[PDB]
């Protein structure tokens, strides 16, 4: 929230009896400031005082017409306020009689003219005024000031050395209204008479700008559906159920009927009817109720590798499913299921898994309504591999001149049940490993080897094996008998 | 008071879904009938239904847009009623779907287009439509039907092959609005899209159509003073005591403000202010207070003739008098005075009177306020004339051979006091009358004349005389001695 701050303050004015005076006050703040006009100290009430508001609520214009003097001759003020703060600015109004209107006071030599431009074509409203010093020309539309501040806009104020005009680049229905030009200088202010501007739109039968688009949802179960029609003359947009009109009869709105539905208990068809004097046009929306999908058939494992598992499942649903979501995690991992989104078939291979691991699964169905309940789970296990790492911390030491003790720790990557180990040893480590002497052992971390020849350097290497095959050999260690 | 009677009854219709249908009902009666639209005994209440009233209250239009079937498909009725009677007429509405629109049903091939004509120039809106049988083209303005019934009017419908049109002679602000054309046949009715028509008035400063004209009146004491202004755009008219605005101070009407003043006590000036953005104009009315004039000075006779009397009088008033009224009658007439209106001075000669008659007179003063009390009367008498008719029934008869008896009746037109008579007689009626023998007599109707010569025819003539002179002689009678 921010307190109100002035974007545009009213200026002193010097008008002429039986004329117009306008005061402008704009302010910004959060929430939107209210603007109030005071004559010390009173909310202004009168038949000739009129407060006109900007469409954006930026503020308001105090318009005094016709000026009668010296009642109106006074100090007025604008107060902008929200529940965060308050600001005010004062301003003076002077009204003169033409008995005592100074010469050189702004005079309208020619005022704006009634004009009819068609849409999107450039219209020009013109103002000739003289005075000494030379009068500055400004414009008012529907009592509000016309903003031509941006040189870069549709609407630009041109002034030449001969007094100026207002140029509207691209016409809109919004442009239509009552324009008056205003000649000001250091002596005062004078208005021209109002000249209306009208804009002709070619007569067109009605047409749907935004037709009403079909839906499905679970019961109770609500939706707002928009029907927009446009054309000239702009039509009435009436929402019609088959025969009966929801909207009463006394009210048919223009160009926009948006329908609110509570508790869509049943499937239905609805009609949006738009009509003007040139025709009736119609358009239907299909409202049907269907639920979220049923849980899929329980997943079945039909393929497995050491790093993948392929699932197949029944759709479990009477109507077509858009796609599936597969839920997966390790048998005892307890974070919420990891999910693979956007699976467009009833079979999928989950890859990037680890060898010899237990996995948990479910399948979820998704249709246009949304996401259904997860299927019942299936448990399974990835295949084994040969180990992908050597036994760790391999050590050997002398027991006697003829026997040694070899030990190791389990490989970090067994990729399966360790069925055993193979111990390779030799006095010549340059041989191929298949030509070393070999000692097979069951699952264990230590063994003894005898019948060695004394006072020799033996090189030793160890691997693990699963049901699949041999793992890698440890790098050579040496032991001396 | 007269009961309501239909001038225009609605007709059955066959429209198309999401379109327009209009029903028309007009009726006349004293007092003005109200019109109510019923669907089965019940007043129809605006779904999208709209009842639009004629500016003269002659009736209303029931407009259904957009057409919905088969809800709207029903028997409707118009009921017209005042406190003198009640009437109704029924009508049927048929709405079709374009799924089932018959071949030959009216179609708009081109509908009216937006148009901008300036004031006092004729704009024409065009409509091309087809159908089988050929469609009849009609027009609606601002939802009310356009009456081109009088061939003799500003507004006439043109027809060629496959087209109709609307032609508006001399454009007026009233003509501005939203026009749509309508194609009808035995299959049904179809509307085009609405196209607005504009009438652009070149902008003008305000001006007084009916300025405020001064007054005088008695205290308490009331008057309505009217101020009218016109121009484009039409201005506001405010009444001012010359410093401040008369309450409702902020309320401002358009182009016509009339000030009602109750219980006037004093003389004053009032200011009427009309103002626009292109300038302010002012205008004053003078209110001053006093009653009808004081009665004039008693009239004085300064001239008299046998047929006229001239009056002179003092005005009797502190302020100027506009003119006078002279009252006159015979003195012994007990009927009300005859009056001579519009006498612009303080002297006047009343002519066409009868000789030697008594007359009564009075003078009345009139100012801008009104007519004052009559003056005190003056009595007088017209002058005498010589008689203007001869003595009547003149007869003479023998008394002796030397004397005759002459008698007569008074002239009908003495024009004065008969002072006497003169009897002319002779034996030679060929002489001039002044050479006859003569016998003067006082006021009487009979005389004797002697010393006549026997056995002779005497011719006799008699006249009357007043103080003025001799009247006419009777025609000759004869008497024999
Ligand atoms: C449905 O409409 C309500 C109405 O307030 C709105 O808040 C909600 O966001 C809408 N929901 C959807 C799913 O459009
Ligand atoms: C909805 O429209 C479809 C046409 O594809 C039709 O087969 C189905 O029976 C309609 N459903 C209802 C509930 O009317
Ligand atoms: C003055 O105005 C009132 C307003 O209704 C009207 O009734 C009355 O007849 C008017 N008087 C005159 C003298 O015009
Ligand atoms: C009204 O104004 C006139 C000037 O037109 C002035 O002579 C007169 O004295 C004024 N009367 C009053 C009562 O103010």
Author numbering:
A (entry chain A), B (entry chain B): 28 to 508
From the primary publication:
Vertebrate type-IIa RPTPs comprise LAR, PTPσ and PTPδ, which share common domain architecture with a single transmembrane (TM) helix flanked by a large extracellular domain (ECD) and cytoplasmic tandem PTP domains: the membrane-proximal PTP domain (D1) is catalytically active, whereas the membrane-distal PTP domain (D2) is inactive. In mammals, presynaptic type-IIa RPTPs form trans-synaptic adhesion by specifically binding to their cognate postsynaptic organizers through their ECDs for inducing synaptic differentiation of neurons.
The meB insertion of PTPδ is important for binding between PTPδ and IL1RAPL1. The lack of meB reduces the affinity fivefold. When the apo structure of PTPδ Ig1-Fn2 containing meA3 and lacking meB (PTPδA3B−), which we determined at 3.5 Å resolution, is superposed onto the IL1RAPL1-ECD-bound structure of PTPδ Ig1-Fn2 using the Ig1–Ig2 unit of PTPδ as the reference, the Ig3 domain of the apo PTPδA3B− is oriented in the opposite direction from that of the IL1RAPL1-ECD-bound PTPδ and cannot interact with IL1RAPL1, even if structural flexibility of the linker between the Ig2 and Ig3 domains of PTPδ is assumed. Therefore, the meB insertion likely acts as an adjustable linker to locate the Ig3 domain of PTPδ in the appropriate position for interacting with the Ig1 domain of IL1RAPL1, representing how the meB insertion contributes to the affinity between PTPδ and IL1RAPL1.
